[PDB]
Amino acid sequence: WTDAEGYYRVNIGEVLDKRYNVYGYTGQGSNVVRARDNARANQEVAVKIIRNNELMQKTGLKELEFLKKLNDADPDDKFHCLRLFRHFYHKQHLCLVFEPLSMNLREVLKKYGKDVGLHIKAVRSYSQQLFLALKLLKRCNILHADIKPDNILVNESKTILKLCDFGSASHVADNDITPYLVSRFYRAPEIIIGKSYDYGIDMWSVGCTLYELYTGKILFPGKTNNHMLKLAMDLKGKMPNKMIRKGVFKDQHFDQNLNFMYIEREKVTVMSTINPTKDLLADLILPEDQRKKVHQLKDLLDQILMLDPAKRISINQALQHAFIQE
Ligand SMILES: Nc1ncnc2c1ncn2[C@@H]1O[C@H](COP(=O)(O)OP(=O)(O)NP(=O)(O)O)[C@@H](O)[C@H]1O
Ligand SMILES: [Mg+2]
């Protein structure tokens, strides 16, 4: 029944936990299936079937405890985090029963068109809901470590979003010194440099997502960790000297004179100063009411995209920003 890799071979029409009748797909190789709960008047549910093996089962149980913690902390469901209904085992696989949702934000952008992006009013509502998710994430001692359009789901009417996929989530007391934490394009500079990180990494990831939600394009589509720093410095300039010294992977990107080494058949180029060339306003941009809102988003992105997490806009200040309050 289980694959060599550890995946479960799902069947359309199969009944899970003697109640969940699987009727459709959402995404296969953990496999997420759409089911109807026969015990609860055929109500729609999403069942996440976690991969077997050894390492995947550990992350599944880790996902279970984090979702339970966030759900108990938010009884009224006003902090936009995915709702776990219950859990069961099926043919050695841990199965998580979730609230049913329509599509992820990556899927909605594809339906919006090639580099079209969402309407400024939708981006405004989505940002507030994402900032509310960060508030609950910070209230609990949880780091999502994978905020991106693929991991944010929306309801049928596309009015309510939910932060999903807590498979790569971690506790704040846990400080794993890894430069590969968070999907590369949404990876904060403090992860890459090897600096002590906190809730700011999730804030950075939200900023990358908010630019992508309006433009339909990835903010920093870097090939490697070094290219990610170059693209981040192409907007805000060179990283502050006090931040570079605090890191662990200092030597891998910066020399003894604190100058950045850009990689382009190896090709290494020494850079003393990086001038801010990337124009957010030009890349983001019709009516005066909408134009004023794009300018407010631009100022909010400037405050989120600060290289030093200590200079980064807080969750409360992001919620109170002119772009949200109108
Ligand atoms: N509650 C849900 N309702 C409807 N679809 C869901 C739900 N949760 C997940 N999905 C779908 O399944 C996809 C992947 O789910 P996810 O939680 O990311 O499992 P995963 O594939 O193991 N993790 P990953 O692909 O690394 O983010 C999501 O992008 C959705 O398309
Ligand atoms: Mg997947």
Side-chain angles (χ1 to χ4, degrees), residues 26 30 32 46 48 82 98-99 101 104 107 150-151 153 165:
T26 322
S30 309
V32 180
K48 183 171 174 165
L82 181 64
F98 294 122
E99 64 172 315
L101 289 158
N104 60 52
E107 286 170 312
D150 313 83
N151 296 334
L153 263 80
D165 185 45

